[PDB]
């Protein structure tokens, strides 16, 4: 009802808590911060400019800028103008997907591919609508 909204909130919070911990090392190894890690993953889908990363994130442009030219300085991200990723930035993503899919696999090894398929169809349809509403304001 609005039980689903609370569940989702709690589900997303839980996924972030797990992700943080599993990614603590890789991040330390890269000089990277959590939020920077995110930008690097947020940027895993499309090249973005500071404002877009700020809008799609809620935080004050100031903070988003500090962590953005730290990634350029680290050659983890790059200009063109927009912001794409660099090999060291990619290698990070690979190492990230790897830690993620190894545990994701675990807790889902006894799942039924068909049931998961339909579930996703629904989520993809809600994702589509979420993005759509987000375009206006």
Residues 49-68 that bind a second copy (CB under 8 A): 55-60
| CB contact at 8 A, 81 and 88 | no
- Give residues with Cβ within 8 angstroms of 113, minimum separation 6: none
> Per CB under 8 A, does 111 bind a second copy?
yes
> Per CB under 6 A, does 59 bind ligand KAN?
yes
SS3 (DSSP) at 73: helix
Q: What DSSP state is assigned to residue 74?
A: T
What the block records as the tokens of 117 is 């398929």
Can you tell me which of 62, 80, 81, 131 binds a second copy, judged by CB under 8 A?
131
Using the minimum distance from each CB to a second copy, give the nearer residue, 80 or 109: 109
> Per CB under 8 A, does 88 bind a second copy?
no
Q: What whole-number distance in Å separates Cα of residue 81 and Cα of residue 110? A: 46
Q: How many CB atoms lie within 10 A of CB 41?
A: 17
Q: To the nearest whole angstrom, how small is the minimum distance from the Cβ of residue 112 to ligand KAN?
A: 24
Q: To the nearest whole angstrom, how small is the minimum distance from the Cβ of residue 1 to a second copy?
A: 6
Stretch that binds ligand KAN, among 11-19, 74-82, 111-119, 123-131 (CB under 6 A): 11-19
> Per CB under 6 A, does 54 bind ligand KAN?
no
């Amino acid at each position: 009802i609005e039980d689903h909204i609370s569940f989702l909130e709690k589900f997303i919070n839980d996924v972030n808590t797990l992700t943080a911990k599993l990614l603590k090392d890789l991040q330390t190894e890269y000089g990277i911060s959590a939020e920077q890690s995110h930008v690097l993953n947020m940027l895993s889908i499309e090249a973005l400019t500071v404002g877009q990363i700020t809008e799609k994130q809620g935080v004050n442009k100031a903070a988003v800028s500090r962590r953005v030219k730290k990634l350029l300085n680290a050659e983890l991200v790059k200009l063109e103008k927009i912001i794409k990723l660099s090999n060291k930035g990619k290698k990070y993503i690979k190492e990230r997907k790897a830690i993620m899919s190894h545990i994701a696999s675990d807790m889902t090894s006894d799942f039924d591919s068909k049931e998961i398929e339909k579930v996703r169809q629904v989520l993809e349809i809600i994702d589509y609508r979420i993005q759509s509403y987000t375009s206006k304001l």
